[PDB]
Ligand binder design. Structure first.
Ligand SMILES: Cc1ccc(C(=O)Nc2cccc(C(F)(F)F)c2)cc1C(=O)Nc1cnc(Nc2ccc(N3CCN(C)CC3)cc2)nc1
Length: 255
C-alpha cells in the first residue's frame, strides 16, 4: 500500500545519480546517470513551470503500456519537483549520430538492412497496439552497445511528414510508414539529411507533382522500391510494418 502522492513506478531520488548531460533545453533535460550505483540509466528531468507535471508524466504512463525489446524501456519516475522519468540507457546514442562515427561509417549494407528490419519490428509492435509514433526518424532511434536498435521519442519539419499529415494534421500509423520510408534514406546514407540540397517548400512542391526523393547514393534499387511503397499517395496503399519487416529481413538474409 503505497502513498497516494507516489506513482506505482516511483523510486526515491536518492537511488539516482546524474552524471552526464546528454541534452538540455525547452521542457527540461536528459542525463546519463546511475541507479543504486551499478546500473546505468537515462533520466529526463522536467523544467519547472515549462509545462504541467501531469502533462510531463503522461509520457511515462504511455510507456507503461508500450513495453517491448525493440522500444526504450521505462524504468521509473520521481513525481516530486523536479519530476524525472527514468529509462534504460543505450550506449551508442542516436542512430543519426552513430552512423557518422568511425564504426557507423564502416557498417555494411547488410548491417544497415538488419537495423532497418529491427526498427520495422518495433514499429510492428507499435502498430499492433494501435499507437502512433508521430515522429519516426533516425534522431529518435537509439543504438545499443551490441548494435541493436530501439524506438524512442525525445519530444523534439516537413521532410519526414507525409502530405495528409502536413495538410490535414492527420497522423496515423500510415504516416509513420511514410516517415519510415524517409528514415530508410537516413540509414543508407549514413545519416545524411533527406532530399539533399532541397528546402521544405521545394520538397512540398515536388511531392504534390508526384515526384519522390531522388535515389540516394549507393542505395540498393530493391531498397529504393520498398521506400517507394512507403511513399504512396493514399495512406491506405502504404504497407504495414509487419510486411516491411518481412521484406527487409529477406533482403538482409540475401546479403
Ligand atoms: C529519459 C527518457 C524518457 C523517455 C524516453 C522515450 O523514448 N520516450 C518515449 C515516449 C513515447 C513513446 C516512445 C516510444 F517510442 F518508445 F514508443 C518513447 C527516452 C528517454 C531517454 O532519453 N532515454 C535515453 C536517452 N539516451 C540514451 N543513450 C544515449 C543517447 C545519446 C548519447 N549521445 C552520444 C554521445 N554524445 C556525446 C551525446 C549523445 C549517448 C547515449 N539512452 C536512453
Amino acid at each position: 500500500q503505497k502513498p497516494w502522492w507516489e506513482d506505482e513506478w516511483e523510486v526515491p531520488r536518492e537511488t539516482l545519480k546524474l552524471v552526464e548531460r546528454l541534452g538540455a533545453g525547452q521542457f527540461g533535460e536528459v542525463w546519463m546517470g546511475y541507479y543504486n550505483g551499478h546500473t546505468k540509466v537515462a533520466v529526463k528531468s522536467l523544467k519547472q513551470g515549462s509545462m504541467s507535471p501531469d502533462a510531463f508524466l503522461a509520457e511515462a504512463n504511455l510507456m507503461k503500456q508500450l513495453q517491448h525489446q525493440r522500444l526504450v524501456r521505462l524504468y521509473a519516475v520521481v513525481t516530486q519537483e523536479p519530476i524525472y522519468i527514468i529509462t534504460e540507457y543505450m550506449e551508442n546514442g542516436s542512430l543519426v549520430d552513430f552512423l557518422k562515427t568511425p564504426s557507423g561509417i564502416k557498417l555494411t549494407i547488410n548491417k544497415l538492412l538488419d537495423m532497418a528490419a529491427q526498427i520495422a519490428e518495433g514499429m510492428a509492435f507499435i502498430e499492433e497496439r494501435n499507437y502512433i509514433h508521430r515522429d519516426l526518424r533516425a534522431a529518435n532511434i537509439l543504438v545499443s552497445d551490441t548494435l541493436s536498435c530501439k524506438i524512442a521519442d525525445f519530444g523534439l519539419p516537413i521532410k519526414w511528414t507525409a502530405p495528409e499529415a502536413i495538410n490535414y494534421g492527420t497522423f496515423t500509423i500510415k504516416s509513420d510508414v511514410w516517415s519510415f520510408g524517409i528514415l530508410l534514406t537516413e540509414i543508407v546514407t549514413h545519416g545524411r539529411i533527406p532530399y539533399p540540397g532541397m528546402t521544405n517548400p521545394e520538397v512540398i512542391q515536388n511531392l504534390e507533382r508526384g515526384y519522390r526523393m531522388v535515389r540516394p547514393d549507393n542505395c540498393p534499387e530493391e531498397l529504393y522500391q520498398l521506400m517507394r511503397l512507403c511513399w504512396k499517395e493514399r495512406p491506405e496503399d502504404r504497407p504495414t510494418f509487419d510486411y516491411l519487416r518481412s521484406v527487409l529481413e529477406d533482403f538482409f538474409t540475401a546479403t
